[PDB]
Design a protein around this ligand. Sequence first.
Ligand SMILES: C[C@]12CC[C@@H]3c4ccc(O)cc4CC[C@H]3[C@@H]1CC[C@@H]2O
Ligand SMILES: C[C@]12CC[C@@H]3c4ccc(O)cc4CC[C@H]3[C@@H]1CC[C@@H]2O
Ligand SMILES: [Cl-]
Lengths: 224, 232, 11, 9
Amino acid sequence: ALSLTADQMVSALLDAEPPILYSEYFSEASMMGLLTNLADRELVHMINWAKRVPGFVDLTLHDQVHLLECAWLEILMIGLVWRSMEHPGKLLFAPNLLLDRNQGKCVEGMVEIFDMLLATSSRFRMMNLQGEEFVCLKSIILLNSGVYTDHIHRVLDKITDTLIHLMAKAGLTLQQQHQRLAQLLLILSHIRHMSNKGMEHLYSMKCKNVPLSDLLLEMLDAHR
Amino acid sequence: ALSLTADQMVSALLDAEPPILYSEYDPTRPFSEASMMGLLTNLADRELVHMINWAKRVPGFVDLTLHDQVHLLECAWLEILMIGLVWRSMEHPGKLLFAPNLLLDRNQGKCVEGMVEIFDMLLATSSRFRMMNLQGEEFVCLKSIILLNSGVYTFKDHIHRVLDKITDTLIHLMAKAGLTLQQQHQRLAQLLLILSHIRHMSNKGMEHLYSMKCKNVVPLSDLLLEMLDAHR
Amino acid sequence: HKLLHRILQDS
Amino acid sequence: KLLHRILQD
Ligand SMILES: C[C@]12CC[C@@H]3c4ccc(O)cc4CC[C@H]3[C@@H]1CC[C@@H]2O
Ligand SMILES: C[C@]12CC[C@@H]3c4ccc(O)cc4CC[C@H]3[C@@H]1CC[C@@H]2O
Ligand SMILES: [Cl-]
């Protein structure tokens, strides 16, 4: 893991990418149904992706479970925000479920989460985020988000090296590399915030009682 | 489409490959005929959506009228699901990898009436691919051929042109892999002859699915109902 | 029309 | 939990 070159790290991450999944082809119980069904199916692919994030299968099963429980909604969200980059004003949940901001209103308390997601998407667009940078960010999220609840920090340093390598290769000055690195990592703070808000929204939906999968339920539960 | 080199054909087809999907297999319970048919048709339905978008990326396919596109997909869909399954299952002797969380042996195929004989044909096809050492580049070519060929005499010179291009591409891959000229046409024949078996299996599977529907074993999505209905 | 006919038009 | 199993199978 820590022996790979930056290019090999990027290659590995690109190769590990999960597929884009489809929705079914609205009320509050209907849209939440589509969204949660999609999320549950994506979750299964995410767990495969995780095992191919360099250093992750090196961890104990307990630690793997913990990171995924902490990270999963953050990872779904950065995925969605990436998919939606070239669709200003819309969220590309699936190629056949492209939702504008106003459709957020069908579901109580969602338009705000929609707004935060759109803002992130808009932010990435302005930064001209690259795919190779995106997969680095997604790996950082997996490994960082549960890490406070040494090998992991070495792997995190490697991914930072990889990000800097991409910016160097793109022709950015030293000063521009550090600034862009900073800009990208600060967005992860916003993504953590969105995940927190999304987690509470999902919990309250469970309470009103759309059905949730067992898997989705225990992911939810771990956040107590 | 007709301008693509062989390598660009191969690259386009590799790029267009759909993902491997997961089933909703629930291991808390033993299989029933209904639950197993439910799993398999739920999987088929979701794979169909990806197949349809794959089809649009096969060279020459979106040149066709919407009616012709519909026709080809209606004729080929189960053949395409099956050749994918058989490809997925190649490195799992004696088992069908319907999904990474749904790996089945012929014994499990027995919980569905009339299914085990279709499993056996699928398994034998998988063994055949394994014994031939079928390559991924060869596999994507075959799947494209199925798409464009299976409905063409139930409908075009344009499709035949593309089919000829895929033939050139298959030979190119074999030459590049160091096969002698004789070996090239022998292997081309062997691969194409397997398509006859896949057609046959599709016809059995279609008759099987129809009986399941006609006995109210599983509910089918509107898409699956209409695919099935296209065949009578 | 057939469901497929419409579905095919979705990007 | 369930998750515990995916990670192994
Ligand atoms: C979890 C929610 C439903 C599932 C949503 C989803 C579903 C699928 C997906 O790929 C990304 C996202 C991010 C936003 C998530 C939502 C935030 C609140 C809502 O409950
Ligand atoms: C169509 C059947 C269910 C769906 C099956 C399936 C489902 C998914 C898939 O990827 C391939 C196949 C091939 C075998 C199919 C079966 C043959 C008979 C049965 O009814
Ligand atoms: Cl899916």
